[PDB]
Design an enzyme around this catalytic site. Structure first.
Site, PDB file in Angstrom:
ATOM      1  N   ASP A 139      30.708  -1.014   8.893  1.00 21.41           N
ATOM      2  CA  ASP A 139      30.066  -2.287   9.359  1.00 21.41           C
ATOM      3  C   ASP A 139      29.546  -2.120  10.759  1.00 21.41           C
ATOM      4  O   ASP A 139      29.577  -3.057  11.557  1.00 21.41           O
ATOM      5  CB  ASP A 139      31.058  -3.450   9.247  1.00 21.41           C
ATOM      6  CG  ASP A 139      30.419  -4.861   9.354  1.00 21.41           C
ATOM      7  OD1 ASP A 139      29.225  -5.030   9.045  1.00 21.41           O
ATOM      8  OD2 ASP A 139      31.198  -5.779   9.696  1.00 21.41           O
ATOM      9  N   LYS A 142      23.378  -0.069  10.803  1.00 19.58           N
ATOM     10  CA  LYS A 142      23.240   0.406   9.424  1.00 19.58           C
ATOM     11  C   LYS A 142      22.682   1.784   9.316  1.00 19.58           C
ATOM     12  O   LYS A 142      22.955   2.499   8.334  1.00 19.58           O
ATOM     13  CB  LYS A 142      22.415  -0.560   8.589  1.00 19.58           C
ATOM     14  CG  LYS A 142      22.870  -2.042   8.734  1.00 19.58           C
ATOM     15  CD  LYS A 142      24.398  -2.275   8.577  1.00 19.58           C
ATOM     16  CE  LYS A 142      24.902  -3.569   9.203  1.00 19.58           C
ATOM     17  NZ  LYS A 142      26.356  -3.592   9.474  1.00 19.58           N
ATOM     18  N   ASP A 167      29.578  -3.033   4.310  1.00 19.66           N
ATOM     19  CA  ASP A 167      28.995  -4.333   4.465  1.00 19.66           C
ATOM     20  C   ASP A 167      27.454  -4.265   4.568  1.00 19.66           C
ATOM     21  O   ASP A 167      26.879  -3.234   4.897  1.00 19.66           O
ATOM     22  CB  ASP A 167      29.538  -5.028   5.730  1.00 19.66           C
ATOM     23  CG  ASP A 167      29.247  -6.524   5.736  1.00 19.66           C
ATOM     24  OD1 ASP A 167      29.057  -7.125   4.642  1.00 19.66           O
ATOM     25  OD2 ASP A 167      29.131  -7.149   6.836  1.00 19.66           O
ATOM     26  N   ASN A 168      26.789  -5.356   4.212  1.00 17.90           N
ATOM     27  CA  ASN A 168      25.344  -5.554   4.504  1.00 17.90           C
ATOM     28  C   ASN A 168      24.439  -4.579   3.788  1.00 17.90           C
ATOM     29  O   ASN A 168      23.388  -4.168   4.295  1.00 17.90           O
ATOM     30  CB  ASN A 168      25.019  -5.490   6.000  1.00 17.90           C
ATOM     31  CG  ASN A 168      25.898  -6.338   6.811  1.00 17.90           C
ATOM     32  OD1 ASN A 168      26.741  -5.866   7.559  1.00 17.90           O
ATOM     33  ND2 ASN A 168      25.770  -7.628   6.612  1.00 17.90           N
ATOM     34  N   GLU A 197      27.025 -13.619   5.951  1.00 18.04           N
ATOM     35  CA  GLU A 197      28.101 -14.432   6.546  1.00 18.04           C
ATOM     36  C   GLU A 197      27.590 -15.723   7.064  1.00 18.04           C
ATOM     37  O   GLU A 197      26.577 -15.778   7.785  1.00 18.04           O
ATOM     38  CB  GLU A 197      28.870 -13.623   7.619  1.00 18.04           C
ATOM     39  CG  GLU A 197      27.965 -13.060   8.698  1.00 18.04           C
ATOM     40  CD  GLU A 197      27.593 -11.593   8.488  1.00 18.04           C
ATOM     41  OE1 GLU A 197      27.374 -11.225   7.313  1.00 18.04           O
ATOM     42  OE2 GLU A 197      27.542 -10.769   9.487  1.00 18.04           O
TER      43      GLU A 197
HETATM   44  C1  LIG Z   1      28.568  -6.025  12.489  1.00 18.45           C
HETATM   45  S1  LIG Z   1      29.450  -5.837  14.048  1.00 18.45           S
HETATM   46  C2  LIG Z   1      31.059  -5.423  13.322  1.00 18.45           C
HETATM   47  C3  LIG Z   1      31.685  -6.738  12.731  1.00 18.45           C
HETATM   48  C4  LIG Z   1      33.149  -6.508  12.377  1.00 18.45           C
HETATM   49  N1  LIG Z   1      33.301  -5.398  11.371  1.00 18.45           N
HETATM   50  C5  LIG Z   1      33.652  -7.797  11.805  1.00 18.45           C
HETATM   51  O1  LIG Z   1      33.431  -8.028  10.580  1.00 18.45           O
HETATM   52  O2  LIG Z   1      34.300  -8.599  12.551  1.00 18.45           O
HETATM   53  C6  LIG Z   1      28.865  -4.161  14.362  1.00 18.45           C
HETATM   54  C7  LIG Z   1      29.525  -3.450  15.561  1.00 18.45           C
HETATM   55  O3  LIG Z   1      29.225  -2.051  15.465  1.00 18.45           O
HETATM   56  C8  LIG Z   1      29.249  -1.542  16.796  1.00 18.45           C
HETATM   57  N2  LIG Z   1      28.645  -0.209  16.691  1.00 18.45           N
HETATM   58  C9  LIG Z   1      27.272   0.139  16.549  1.00 18.45           C
HETATM   59  N3  LIG Z   1      27.102   1.441  16.454  1.00 18.45           N
HETATM   60  C10 LIG Z   1      28.370   1.943  16.536  1.00 18.45           C
HETATM   61  C11 LIG Z   1      28.840   3.271  16.530  1.00 18.45           C
HETATM   62  N4  LIG Z   1      27.975   4.321  16.365  1.00 18.45           N
HETATM   63  N5  LIG Z   1      30.130   3.481  16.614  1.00 18.45           N
HETATM   64  C12 LIG Z   1      31.010   2.476  16.739  1.00 18.45           C
HETATM   65  N6  LIG Z   1      30.657   1.219  16.819  1.00 18.45           N
HETATM   66  C13 LIG Z   1      29.329   0.996  16.740  1.00 18.45           C
HETATM   67  C14 LIG Z   1      28.405  -2.555  17.568  1.00 18.45           C
HETATM   68  O4  LIG Z   1      28.618  -2.503  18.983  1.00 18.45           O
HETATM   69  C15 LIG Z   1      28.931  -3.857  16.931  1.00 18.45           C
HETATM   70  O5  LIG Z   1      30.061  -4.411  17.623  1.00 18.45           O
HETATM   71  O1  LIG Z   2      21.616  -9.190  11.432  1.00 16.38           O
HETATM   72  N1  LIG Z   2      22.550  -9.429  10.673  1.00 16.38           N
HETATM   73  O2  LIG Z   2      22.452 -10.334   9.815  1.00 16.38           O
HETATM   74  C1  LIG Z   2      23.692  -8.627  10.675  1.00 16.38           C
HETATM   75  C2  LIG Z   2      24.744  -9.011   9.839  1.00 16.38           C
HETATM   76  C3  LIG Z   2      25.857  -8.228   9.751  1.00 16.38           C
HETATM   77  O3  LIG Z   2      26.954  -8.501   8.989  1.00 16.38           O
HETATM   78  C4  LIG Z   2      25.900  -6.943  10.517  1.00 16.38           C
HETATM   79  O4  LIG Z   2      26.959  -6.208  10.314  1.00 16.38           O
HETATM   80  C5  LIG Z   2      24.780  -6.572  11.328  1.00 16.38           C
HETATM   81  N2  LIG Z   2      24.719  -5.405  12.104  1.00 16.38           N
HETATM   82  O5  LIG Z   2      25.711  -4.703  12.190  1.00 16.38           O
HETATM   83  O6  LIG Z   2      23.668  -5.183  12.686  1.00 16.38           O
HETATM   84  C6  LIG Z   2      23.718  -7.427  11.382  1.00 16.38           C
HETATM   85 CL   LIG Z   3      31.223 -16.840   5.312  1.00 11.71          CL
HETATM   86 MG   LIG Z   4      28.265  -6.764   8.693  1.00 11.57          MG
END
Ligand SMILES: C[S@@+](CC[C@H](N)C(=O)[O-])C[C@H]1O[C@@H](n2cnc3c(N)ncnc32)[C@H](O)[C@@H]1O
Ligand SMILES: O=[N+]([O-])c1cc(O)c(O)c([N+](=O)[O-])c1
Ligand SMILES: [Cl-]
Ligand SMILES: [Mg+2]
Length: 214
Positions: A139, A142, A167-168, A197
């Site tokens: 997650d 992507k 995810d996604n 979400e």
């Molecule tokens: C979609 S959020 C994660 C949401 C979390 N899994 C949740 O459901 O609560 C994506 C996160 O990936 C982190 N991220 C992006 N590239 C990454 C990498 N190469 N290694 C580790 N974390 C990274 C970003 O800073 C961001 O906080």
């Molecule tokens: O833009 N989005 O809708 C999302 C949603 C998500 O659940 C993600 O994990 C995300 N991301 O990691 O970039 C972006």
């Molecule tokens: Cl939800």
């Molecule tokens: Mg996600």
């Protein structure tokens, strides 16, 4: 990360200390109604829950922690002695994640590593005492899903039956990952259709079970 601090402050003011469910509900309500945020969320969280219940992982790797929602959510389901290792590239999000995990009562199950997944994955055996992984929740950004999958495989961290859950895969989408795991005989895939979400845009998760390098 002003919004992320607000989410954390909302949780600290309204949720119940030591109560993982309370934390998740506070985040989900805040985010759905006030400030959208990229947490896996409750609906897709129920699918994550089901995967963990079916497969009962004791060593779980999460790529991308953000505010700690998914770390808290998954950690609440794990058995005593289980390890959830979560990797987060952004130091300010990692700091929130750790506060979130501590507050939720689950810190003893979680090991947060600040760094890029591609830097950390090759260190997991030697520096983090990992053997193989039972489950991986992908997650992060992507465009890393496919490269990190191949890196996990190359580094010897996947065993037969290791579960990848991404995810996604529809929105924003992870088409290169999906094409790879679905087309490859090395992965047995199931798709779980759901929603973005907090919203009604269609999304989904992919579960890809490793079958060994065949
Ligand atoms: C979609 S959020 C994660 C949401 C979390 N899994 C949740 O459901 O609560 C994506 C996160 O990936 C982190 N991220 C992006 N590239 C990454 C990498 N190469 N290694 C580790 N974390 C990274 C970003 O800073 C961001 O906080
Ligand atoms: O833009 N989005 O809708 C999302 C949603 C998500 O659940 C993600 O994990 C995300 N991301 O990691 O970039 C972006
Ligand atoms: Cl939800
Ligand atoms: Mg996600």
């Amino acid at each position: 990360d002003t919004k992320e601090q607000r989410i954390l402050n909302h949780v600290l003011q309204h949720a119940e200390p030591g109560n993982a469910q309370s934390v998740l509900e506070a985040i989900d309500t805040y985010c759905e109604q006030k400030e959208w945020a990229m947490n896996v969320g409750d609906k897709k969280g129920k699918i994550v829950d089901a995967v963990i219940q079916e497969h009962q992982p004791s060593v779980l790797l999460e790529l991308g922690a953000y505010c700690g929602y998914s770390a808290v959510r998954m950690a609440r389901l794990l058995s005593p002695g289980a390890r959830l290792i979560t990797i987060e590239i952004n130091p300010d999000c990692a700091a929130i994640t750790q506060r979130m995990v501590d507050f939720a009562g689950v810190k003893d199950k979680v090991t947060l590593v600040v760094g890029a997944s591609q830097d950390i994955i090759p260190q997991l055996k030697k520096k983090y005492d990992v053997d193989t992984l039972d489950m991986v929740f992908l997650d992060h950004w992507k465009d890393r899903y496919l490269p990190d999958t191949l890196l996990l495989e190359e580094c010897g961290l996947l065993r037969k039956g290791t579960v990848l859950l991404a995810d996604n895969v529809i929105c924003p989408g992870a088409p290169d990952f999906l094409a790879h795991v679905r087309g490859s005989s090395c992965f047995e895939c199931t798709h779980y259709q759901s929603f973005l979400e907090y919203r009604e845009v269609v999304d989904g998760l992919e579960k890809a079970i490793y079958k060994g390098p065949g």
